[model samples]
Every structure is written in C-alpha cells, then in structure tokens.
Target: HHGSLEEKIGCLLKFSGDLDDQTCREDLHILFSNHGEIKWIDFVRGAKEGIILFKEKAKEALGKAKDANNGNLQLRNKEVTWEVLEGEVEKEALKKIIEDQQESLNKWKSKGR
Candidate 1:
C-alpha cells in the first residue's frame, strides 16, 4: 500500500553471505510453503544471491514478505531482501535493478579507505 502497486509475483532474495545451493532450496521450501507453484530455484556460484520463481499472480507479493531480517539464513550470516520482479515488461527493469545494485556494490568495494 505504501510502496508502488507493482506486486511481486516472484522474489529475488539476496542472502547476506554465501550459502550452499541445497541450503537455499531448503530455505525457500520452508518459507513459501504452499504459497504457489515454484517454477525455478537456484543459487549462483560465487554470488551471494539466489533466485526463486513462483506462480505469476494477479498481484505481487513483495509487500507481504515477513521476518526478513538481515544476517543468517537458518543460522548462517545473511541479509535477505525481496523485490517484485517486472511482469510482462521489457528487460530494462531487470537490468536497472541489477545495475543499480552493482553500482552500490562497486562503491562499497571502492571505499576501502
């Protein structure tokens, strides 16, 4: 209600730290139980984030995510954040989100002062 109307039919959760692929799958299975059909789930090697695909719905579920505390996914230090993926739109939206996050990460890396 406070944020944009774009509902997240799926979610992209960035784990705080690197976690095993199996662990990520387990976490998602536990969190989104019976919410909807899971299309795809995977963890990118060397990356701290994981992808989760849920059934496309009439609305997004970003605003509905609960207990998203930073640090530790099932006892591992990891920060979790969720976002509503763009639906039926150009790839520009996804690119934008990735680019913005990349820039922020670069800045953080550069500021080693």
Candidate 2:
C-alpha cells in the first residue's frame, strides 16, 4: 500500500532578512525547539536573509513561523518569513538518495566505527 512508501525526514526553511544572530537564534530556538530538529543554519550576510533546515517531523515549526507575527511588528515590516524546501520529498526518494550514496556512507561509517 501507499503507506509503505511514505517516510518522514526533514524540511528546509528560508527566512527573509538580515537579523541579529543571537536574537534570531533565540527566537527560532524558542519557537521551533519543540517541533523538530534544526539541522543547519545559514545566514546570507548583508542580505537580511537565512535558511533553516528542519527534520520532517517539525512541520509544526513551519506552522508556528507562518502564524507568528514576528512579535507584532508592522505587517509591512514583518521581519521573518519562510518557505518549505523541495515541496515534500517522498520517503522512498530520501532512502533512494541515501542508498545512491551508500558507498560513501559505508566509507565514513567504517572509519568512525
């Protein structure tokens, strides 16, 4: 059935704006801490924008950001925004992608193990 093909992994969110890292990190940590794992953070210097990668289970984090008002700043001056990465990736797709990289993983796994 379709259920077998489905797998939950992660998502990426891009925030629009150059924000103070400490403050932005704090807000994100507070807002998304409970939803899912934050895997990566990248800031586009001087552009007022950044991207956040979150595990698939953290859809709630996306919801929270979208619904949130950036602490009620002027709607026009809204300081935060985000978009889901790659729409949604099939669980099989994720696995397949990893499988495609199996040799590389094995190489690293053996070294670490």
lDDT, each prediction? 0.41, 0.49
Instruction: Choose the strongest candidate by TM-score.
Output: 2
Give candidate 1 misplaced runs (Cα > 4 Å).
1-27, 57-62, 66-79, 85-113
| Residue 78 shift from truth in candidate 2, angstroms | 5.5
* Residue-wise C-alpha lDDT for candidate 2, range 4-93, written one tens digit per residue: 756545455555543554455545554565545454455545656555555543344664545565431111124556644454542433
Provide C-alpha RMSD values for all models, in order.
12.7, 7.6
Which ten contiguous residues of candidate 2 have the minimum total lDDT?
Answer: 69-78
Name the lDDT of candidate 2. 0.49
lDDT per residue, candidate 1, 31-108, as tens digits? 554434333444445766554444432112223333344322331223444343355432333444455556555753
